[PDB]
Amino acid sequence: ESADLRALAKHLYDSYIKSFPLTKAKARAILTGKKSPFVIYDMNSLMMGEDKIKFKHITSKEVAIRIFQGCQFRSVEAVQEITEYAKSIPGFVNLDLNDQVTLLKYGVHEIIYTMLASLMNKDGVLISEGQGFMTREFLKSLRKPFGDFMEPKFEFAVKFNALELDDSDLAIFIAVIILSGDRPGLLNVKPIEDIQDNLLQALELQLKLNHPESSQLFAKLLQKMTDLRQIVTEHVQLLQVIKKTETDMSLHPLLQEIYKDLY
Amino acid sequence: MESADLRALAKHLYDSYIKSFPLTKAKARAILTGKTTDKSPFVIYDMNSLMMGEDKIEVAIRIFQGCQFRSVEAVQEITEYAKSIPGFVNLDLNDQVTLLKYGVHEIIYTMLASLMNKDGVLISEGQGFMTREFLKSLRKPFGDFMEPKFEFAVKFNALELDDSDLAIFIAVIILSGDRPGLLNVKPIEDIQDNLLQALELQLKLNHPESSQLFAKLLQKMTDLRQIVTEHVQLLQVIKKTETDMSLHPLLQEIYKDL
Numbered sequence: 001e002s003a004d005l006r007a008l009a010k011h012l013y014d015s016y017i018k019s020f021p022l023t024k025a026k027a028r029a030i031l032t033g034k035k036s037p038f039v040i041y042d043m044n045s046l047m048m049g050e051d052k053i054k055f056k057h058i059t060s061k062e063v064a065i066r067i068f069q070g071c072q073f074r075s076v077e078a079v080q081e082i083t084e085y086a087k088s089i090p091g092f093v094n095l096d097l098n099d100q101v102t103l104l105k106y107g108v109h110e111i112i113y114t115m116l117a118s119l120m121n122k123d124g125v126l127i128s129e130g131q132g133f134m135t136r137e138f139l140k141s142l143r144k145p146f147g148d149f150m151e152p153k154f155e156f157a158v159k160f161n162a163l164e165l166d167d168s169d170l171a172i173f174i175a176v177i178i179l180s181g182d183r184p185g186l187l188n189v190k191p192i193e194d195i196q197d198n199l200l201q202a203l204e205l206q207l208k209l210n211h212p213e214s215s216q217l218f219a220k221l222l223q224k225m226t227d228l229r230q231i232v233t234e235h236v237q238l239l240q241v242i243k244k245t246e247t248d249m250s251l252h253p254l255l256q257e258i259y260k261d262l263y
Numbered sequence: 264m265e266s267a268d269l270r271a272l273a274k275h276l277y278d279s280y281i282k283s284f285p286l287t288k289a290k291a292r293a294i295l296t297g298k299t300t301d302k303s304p305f306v307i308y309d310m311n312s313l314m315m316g317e318d319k320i321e322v323a324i325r326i327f328q329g330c331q332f333r334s335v336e337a338v339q340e341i342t343e344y345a346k347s348i349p350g351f352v353n354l355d356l357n358d359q360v361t362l363l364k365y366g367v368h369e370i371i372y373t374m375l376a377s378l379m380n381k382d383g384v385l386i387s388e389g390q391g392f393m394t395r396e397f398l399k400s401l402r403k404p405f406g407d408f409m410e411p412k413f414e415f416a417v418k419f420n421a422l423e424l425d426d427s428d429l430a431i432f433i434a435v436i437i438l439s440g441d442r443p444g445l446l447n448v449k450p451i452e453d454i455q456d457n458l459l460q461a462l463e464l465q466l467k468l469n470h471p472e473s474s475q476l477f478a479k480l481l482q483k484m485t486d487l488r489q490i491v492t493e494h495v496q497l498l499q500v501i502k503k504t505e506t507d508m509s510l511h512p513l514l515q516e517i518y519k520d521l
C-alpha cells in the first residue's frame with residue numbers, strides 16, 4: 001500500500017496548492033530575499049502602506065486595535081480556505097454533517113497557527129499574499145495587551161519552522177489535525193479515526209522519503225500538537241481579557257456576527 | 264539505531280521499571296479482574312467502610328493527604344527510574360532537575376491509570392480499592408479534583424499498554440527537550456530519539472495488529488500536558504481555601520513556578 005499512501009500525499013498536496021493563496025515555498029523566497037514587499041516597521045510606514053497597497057480590512061481609529069482586527073479579518077478568510085481544503089480529504093465529505101462542522105470548529109485554530117508559521121520568520125510576517133511584511137518589533141511594541149498578544153505567535157513559529165517542513169509535508173499534517181477523533185460532541189468517532197490512521201501512515205512515509213536524514217521527525221512533528229493545543233488555550237484566555245478590558249473594540253453588530261467564532 | 268540495540272534498550276528499561284516501581288500494571292490487573300482468593304482488596308465505598316478499612320489494612324482532607332503521600336513516594340520512584348535511563352545522569356545537573364520537575368506529574372498521571380478502572384482505584388499497594396463514586400462525592404473542591412484522574416485513565420487504558428510498553432513511554436516523557444529553562448537541548452533530544460526508536464519497535468512487535476499505536480500514544484502526551492496544567496491550577500485554588508493542607512517539601516518545590 002506504499003503507492004496508495006503516495007497517491008494520498010500527492011492528492012492532498014495538489015489540493016493544498018489550490019486552496020491556499022501563498023505557499024510556504026513562495027513565502028520563504030520572499031522572506032529570504034530570493035517583487036520586493038512593502039515593509040511596515042512603524043506608524044508612518046503603516047499609514048503609507050494602507051495608502052499605497054490598500055491592505056483590506058479598514059472600516060476605532062487606534063492603530064493597535066486596527067492591527068488586531070486585521071488579524072481577525074484574515075483568520076476568517078483562512079477558516080473558509082481550510083473548510084474548502086477539508087472537503088478534498090478522502091472520506092471527509094462522507095462523514096455525518098454535524099461531525100464535519102465539529103471537526104472544523106475545533107481544528108481551525110490549530111491549523112491557522114500552523115500555517116501562520118509558514119509566513120513568519122524571527123523578524124516578521126508576510127501579509128496580503130506576500131505583498132507586505134510587518135516587523136515583529138513593531139507588532140510587539142503595540143500597547144497594552146496587544147503587543148503581548150502578537151509576540152507568542154512568533155515564539156511558536158520560530159520553533160515550528162526549525163523542523164523545516166515543506167508544503168507537501170504540511171498538506172498531510174493539516175489533514176491529521178482536522179481528523180481528530182477526540183473533539184467534543186463527535187457522534188461517530190470510528191470513521192474519523194480510520195481516516196486519521198490513513199493520514200498518519202501517509203505522513204510517516206512522506207517524512208521518511210522527504211527528510212531521510214531527519215531522525216524521528218514524525219515523532220517530533222506529533223509532539224508539536226502539544227504546543228498547538230497549549231497556545232490555542234492561551235489564545236482564548238488572552239482574547240477574554242481583551243474583551244473584558246477594551247471598550248473601544250466596537251464594530252457594527254453584523255461584523256461582530258461575522259467574527260463570532262474568533263472573538 | 265539498529266534493531267538488536269533497540270531491543271536491548273527496551274529490556275534494560277523494562278527491567279529497571281520493575282525494580283523501581285512497587286506495583287506493576289500486571290499486578291494491578293490481576294487484582295482488579297479478580298478470580299483469586301489471595302489478592303482480593305478491601306473495598307472503600309463510604310464512610311463506614313473507610314473506618315473499617317483503616318482497622319483492616321476530616322475525611323476529604325485525609326483522603327487528599329493519602330493521594331499526596333503516594334504522589335511523593337511516586338516522585339522518589341520516578342527519580343530512581345530516571346537515573347537508570349542511559350545518558351540521563353551524564354546530563355548537566357540543572358537539566359536533570361528541570362526534566363524531573365516538569366516530567367513527574369505527567370508520569371504520575373500515566374502510571375495512576377495502571378491502578379484504575381472505571382469503578383475505582385487501587386490503594387495501599389493493592390490491598391485496598393476505593394470507589395470512584397465515593398471519591399467524586401467528597402465535598403467542596405475535593406470531589407471534582409479526584410474525578411479528572413479517572414476520566415484520563417479510562418481513555419489511556421483503552422490503548423491496552425503493558426508494563427514493557429510503559430517503561431519506554433515514561434522514559435520518552437522524561438527526556439523532553441522542550442521543557443522551560445533547559446540549558447543543553449541537543450543531548451536531551453539525542454537520548455529521546457533513541458527512546459522513540461525503541462518505543463516504535465516495541466509497539467510494532469508487541470501490538471502488531473494495533474495500527475499507528477505509536478502515533479496514538481504520542482497524541483496522549485498532549486492530553487497529559489493539558490491535564491497537568493488544569494491540575495496545578497485547581498491545586499492552587501484549593502491551597503488558598505484550605506489551611507489544613509500541608510504539601511511535602513518535595514512537591515512544594517516542584518510546584519514553585521509550576
Ligand SMILES: Cc1ccc2c(c1)c(-c1ccc(C(=O)O)cc1OCc1ccccc1)nn2C(=O)c1c(Cl)cccc1C(F)(F)F
Nearest residue numbers: 067070071072074075078109112113116125127150153262
Ligand atoms: C502577527 C499575527 C498575530 C496574530 C494573528 C495573526 C498574525 C493571524 C494570521 C493568521 C493567518 C494568516 C494567513 O495569512 O494565513 C495571517 C495572519 O495575520 C496576518 C496579519 C498580520 C498583521 C496584521 C494584519 C494581518 N492570526 N492571528 C491570530 O491572533 C489568530 C490566530 Cl494565530 C489563530 C486563530 C485566530 C486568530 C485571531 F482571530 F484572533 F486573529
Ligand SMILES: Cc1ccc2c(c1)c(-c1ccc(C(=O)O)cc1OCc1ccccc1)nn2C(=O)c1c(Cl)cccc1C(F)(F)F
Nearest residue numbers: 326329330331333334337368371372375384386393409412
Ligand atoms: C484517585 C486519585 C486522585 C488524585 C490523586 C491520586 C489519586 C494520586 C495518586 C497518585 C499516584 C498513586 C500511586 O500509587 O502511584 C496513587 C495515588 O492516589 C492513591 C490514593 C487514592 C485514594 C486515596 C488515597 C490514596 N495523586 N493524586 C493527586 O491529586 C496528585 C497527583 Cl495525580 C500528582 C501529583 C500530586 C498529587 C497531589 F499531591 F495533589 F495529591
